[PDB]
């Protein structure tokens, strides 16, 4: 019941899952979505056409205000960097600026050895 009018939307695009939260201008949570919470779980998610149905779920929780326009914050790789923005363009929302906020360091921390099969 605040009517933020316009607020950026963060798209935490990951591999094992993807989640988009339609925060406000300053950066306050107004409504978040989630593939894991979008019916199918396990790992069936991930896929782009699976995240789209997730972020689209926001237009059902963050619609209580009246977002007439909004930007997009895509972070991290994975099947949900495009899908999300698309579903949002159809949901009825607008757009003000697309950008990738993926954490790309300068050889700072030393990543995990991991995987070796």
């Amino acid at each position: 019941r605040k009517q933020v009018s316009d607020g950026v939307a963060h798209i935490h695009a990951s591999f094992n899952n993807t989640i988009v939260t339609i925060t406000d201008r300053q950066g306050n949570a107004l409504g978040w979505a989630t593939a894991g919470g979008s019916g199918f779980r396990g790992s069936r998610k991930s896929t782009p056409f699976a995240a789209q149905v997730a972020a689209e779920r926001c237009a059902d929780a963050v619609k209580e205000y009246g977002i007439k326009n909004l930007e997009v914050m895509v972070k991290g790789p994975g099947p949900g960097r495009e899908s999300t923005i698309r579903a949002l363009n159809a949901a009825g929302f607008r757009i003000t600026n697309i950008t990738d906020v993926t954490p790309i360091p300068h050889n700072g921390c030393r990543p995990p050895k991991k995987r070796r099969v």
Partner: protein, 51 residues
């Protein structure tokens, strides 16, 4: 990476920034590092680029 266009349309312009960083220098990290594995494979893959 910064997009912005007048006349609402989902054209793209997005894969334009997709040539300097993007899923590349990403997966580059992803798993472990390299150390000797690179200085070597980086100097062998170079051999490839000859013909």
């Amino acid at each position: 990476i910064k997009v912005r266009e007048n006349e609402p349309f989902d054209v793209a312009l997005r894969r334009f920034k997709r040539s300097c960083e993007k899923a590349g220098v990403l997966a580059e990290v992803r798993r472990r590092e390299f150390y000797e594995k690179p200085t070597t494979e980086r100097k062998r893959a170079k051999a490839s680029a000859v013909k």
